[PDB]
Design a protein around this ligand. Structure first.
Ligand SMILES: CC(=O)N[C@@H]1[C@@H](O)[C@H](O[C@@H]2O[C@H](CO)[C@@H](O[C@@H]3O[C@H](CO)[C@@H](O[C@@H]4O[C@H](CO)[C@@H](O)[C@H](O)[C@H]4NC(C)=O)[C@H](O)[C@H]3NC(C)=O)[C@H](O)[C@H]2NC(C)=O)[C@@H](CO)O[C@@H]1O
Ligand SMILES: CC(=O)N[C@@H]1[C@@H](O)[C@H](O[C@@H]2O[C@H](CO)[C@@H](O[C@@H]3O[C@H](CO)[C@@H](O[C@@H]4O[C@H](CO)[C@@H](O)[C@H](O)[C@H]4NC(C)=O)[C@H](O)[C@H]3NC(C)=O)[C@H](O)[C@H]2NC(C)=O)[C@@H](CO)O[C@@H]1O
Ligand SMILES: *[C@@H]1O[C@H](CO)[C@@H](O[C@@H]2O[C@H](CO)[C@@H](O)[C@H](O)[C@H]2NC(C)=O)[C@H](O)[C@H]1NC(C)=O
Ligand SMILES: *[C@@H]1O[C@H](CO)[C@@H](O[C@@H]2O[C@H](CO)[C@@H](O)[C@H](O)[C@H]2NC(C)=O)[C@H](O)[C@H]1NC(C)=O
Ligand SMILES: *[C@@H]1O[C@H](CO)[C@@H](O)[C@H](O)[C@H]1NC(C)=O
Ligand SMILES: *[C@@H]1O[C@H](CO)[C@@H](O)[C@H](O)[C@H]1NC(C)=O
Lengths: 189, 189
């Protein structure tokens, strides 16, 4: 990293390795190496992390694959709607559903100011025509499970997991917890 | 029916044949016969119906099969949550999900008065462990489609269709409309 100092840092709410790397001008993957983190997406609330501060040589790329912006304008299979929870924005939610902000706004012309949405407000999620998820069912959380990783493994999206578990905070999952998990969501025909 | 008079009646919001039969002391199936209704569950907003009033011989049973109270304490497959819309009660919603009011209250100990719930409030739906719906996907409404009938045909529940389409009023469906439809929801193993 060719850093000049290290801070020992307590992980707080909202943190990702991306936001921590930015705060301290470190690299995501430098923090992964130094702390022998098994999964770059998983850092625990209240854990301590040694952070190389002010790196000349930040490695933010070798260990993660950060997706391009969403380009699709619909989500395969489900759901018809999503309910807004604390901290959601339409930008946030369209990214989770892997669609453009634009497509989510277009599906929701009842919203006038796209920046003023209310906890408890229901929005339309634009579902691709002729599409489906192959199985939707119970899953028990195991140690280190995250919505972000479960989406990739089961070929669904963060948003679709959130919609099926709309009152579950992804940051407060417990080993053994039952969530509802959609699988293999795709266009059909 | 051995009725004493007939009223010509305009179907309004909230009406079912059950509520109309009660208002006028008729029978569900007498109204079905007289008006040659193809489906006892389907009456259209603003349609006129001849109602035999004050029947001595009301037939409420021959043409419909009215389900017993729900006895199950969980819903197979999905969803983790449901958002409250105008006119919902926990009694209403537990019936749609084919579970006991009791089981729905027990899953929701954050609710203190079970009779004071708010438009936009999210509740937990108790999903049976080790359960699933086999496919969840798009369906286009055809003439005469109803959530009540679609549940039976596709082996799901009114509540599960509502949860996947939480901003759709079941009384305002249009031919060609795309909804999200779960199928073949059951316990597994
Ligand atoms: C490189 C990068 O920036 N990637 C991000 C990626 O991190 C974002 O995903 C979010 O990551 C955060 C941090 O990992 C997740 O929050 C954690 O969630 C887990 C699970 O709920 C929490 O784990 C629990 O921790 C406690 C102790 O705190 C243990 O007792 C529990 O057993 C444990 N549970 C399990 C099942 O292991 C953890 O505390 C949370 N940490 C924080 C700081 O909140 C978050 O869930 C995750 N978000 C999603 C939607 O999955 C991702 C956002 O999409 O973007 C980039 O990929
Ligand atoms: C015997 C008995 O009491 N059974 C009840 C059963 O009726 C309850 O189910 C509810 O029935 C009502 C009345 O049929 C349903 O409301 C109707 O919904 C349809 C579909 O949205 C509306 O049809 C539309 O009507 C307009 C004209 O008004 C047409 O232009 C449209 O093309 C047409 N759409 C389609 C697809 O055909 C109709 O207007 C509504 N009528 C009224 C009075 O609102 C209602 O959806 C239905 N509820 C559910 C959840 O399915 C049932 C409640 O669960 O309990 C008993 O089974
Ligand atoms: C978000 O959407 C895009 C486009 O639909 C996905 O990207 C493609 O996925 C398929 C596999 O199903 C591949 O054939 C393409 O090569 C993928 N890559 C690209 C650059 O389009 C993308 O995976 C989706 N992202 C997430 C996180 O779900
Ligand atoms: C509500 O729940 C009950 C019990 O789970 C269902 O009743 C049974 O369904 C199975 C078929 O899957 C039959 O083997 C039983 O004989 C059924 N009858 C009875 C009286 O239990 C019931 O069908 C569900 N109702 C709805 C409307 O979904
Ligand atoms: C799925 O089908 C829709 C409807 O045409 C289309 O817009 C969309 O891009 C398709 N998605 C994928 C991933 O192929
Ligand atoms: C499904 O399994 C659950 C979990 O044991 C049980 O309570 C429930 O009654 C079962 N439902 C049916 C329809 O068999």
């Amino acid at each position: 990293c060719g850093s000049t100092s290290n801070i020992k840092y307590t992980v707080v709410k909202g943190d990702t390795l991306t936001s921590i790397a930015k705060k301290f001008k470190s690299g995501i993957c430098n923090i992964v190496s130094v702390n022998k983190l098994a999964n770059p997406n998983l850092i625990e609330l209240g854990a301590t992390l040694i952070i190389p501060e002010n790196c000349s040589n930040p490695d933010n790329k070798s260990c993660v694959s950060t997706p391009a912006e969403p380009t699709e304008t619909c989500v395969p299979g489900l759901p018809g709607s999503y309910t807004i929870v604390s901290g959601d924005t339409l930008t946030n939610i369209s990214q989770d559903f892997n669609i453009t902000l634009d497509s989510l706004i277009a599906a929701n012309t009842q919203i006038e100011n796209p920046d003023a949405i209310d906890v408890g407000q229901i929005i339309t999620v634009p579902v691709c025509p002729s599409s489906q998820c192959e199985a939707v069912g119970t899953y028990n959380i195991v140690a280190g499970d995250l919505f972000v990783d479960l989406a990739a493994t089961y070929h669904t999206t963060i948003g679709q997991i959130k919609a099926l578990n709309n009152n579950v905070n992804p940051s407060k999952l417990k080993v053994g917890q039952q969530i509802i998990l959609p699988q293999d969501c795709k266009n059909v025909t």
